[PDB]
């Protein structure tokens, strides 16, 4: 249910 907001942001 709990999912961390951890996108792959950057170059």
């Amino acid at each position, epitope marked *: 249910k*709990l*999912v*961390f*907001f*951890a*996108p*792959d*942001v*950057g*170059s």
Partner: antibody, heavy 118, light 113 residues
Framework: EVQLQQSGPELVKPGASVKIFCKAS????????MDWVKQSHGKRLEWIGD????????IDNPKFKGKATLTVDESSSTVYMELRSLSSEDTAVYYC???????????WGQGTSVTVSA | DVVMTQTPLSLPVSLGDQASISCRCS???????????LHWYLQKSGQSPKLLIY???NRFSGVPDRFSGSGSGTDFTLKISRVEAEDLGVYFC?????????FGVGTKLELKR
């Protein structure tokens, strides 16, 4: 200076769709992501999704799966959001927001108002 | 969704007073990267929201030291030393630890008469 300029107000018929953009400037567009936030009557804020400019990969709010769709054209430093099958519940102001690697929405656009009416 | 509960909804103050806005969450906000991703935004009338404080206690660039934040786990507080006229508006707390990102209902900082 960081600038997030969004498209102008929209007037859409019930059941139709609309695509709003958000052009960025004042920084390297590729080192940051772009998020979208909804603000309705009562000024309640709802996060819609986050998109990466290099890959187009998105992290979406599941409550907007049948409503919003995020795309990006990094050549123009522009991020789009499509809102489809519009009803009165979609009449709101939609905001653009920059997301660095800290996962904090820091800079916001001026907002795009979408009004649903036949 | 992680629920953000703000107290109070309306905060009438006189200029110079101190103001405390509470934001309690349904669960801990400690991201797996160690950071507590709780932030405070200010939206003045007819404007866009603006980032005042991020990660509990970090002032964004340009924010006066008049503003300060504290808390951990599920209880957080935004404090203003001496409220100024430019500080009036709606204050939102928001978390970016879990998906989807959620916001508080908002706290309107109004002038007292």
């Amino acid at each position: 200076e960081v600038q997030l300029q969004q498209s102008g107000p929209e007037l859409v018929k019930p059941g139709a769709s609309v695509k709003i953009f958000c052009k960025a400037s004042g920084y390297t567009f590729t080192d940051y992501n772009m998020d979208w936030v909804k603000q309705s009557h009562g000024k309640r804020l709802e996060w819609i999704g986050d998109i990466n400019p290099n890959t187009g990969v998105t992290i979406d709010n599941p409550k907007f799966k049948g409503k919003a769709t995020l795309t990006v054209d990094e050549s123009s430093s522009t991020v789009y959001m499509e809102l489809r099958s519009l009803s009165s519940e979609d009449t709101a102001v939609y905001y653009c927001a920059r997301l660095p690697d800290n996962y904090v929405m820091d800079y916001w656009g001026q907002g795009t108002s979408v009004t649903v009416s036949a | 969704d992680v629920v953000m509960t703000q107290t109070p909804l309306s905060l009438p103050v006189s200029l110079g007073d101190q103001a405390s806005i509470s934001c309690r969450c349904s669960q801990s906000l400690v991201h797996r990267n160690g950071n507590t991703n709780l932030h405070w935004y200010l939206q003045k009338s007819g404007q866009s929201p603006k980032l005042l404080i991020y990660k509990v206690s970090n002032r964004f660039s340009g924010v006066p030291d008049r503003f300060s934040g504290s808390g951990s786990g599920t209880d957080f507080t935004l404090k203003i030393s001496r409220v100024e006229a430019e500080d009036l508006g709606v204050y939102f707390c928001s978390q970016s630890t879990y998906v989807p990102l959620t916001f508080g209902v908002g706290t309107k900082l109004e002038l007292k008469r």
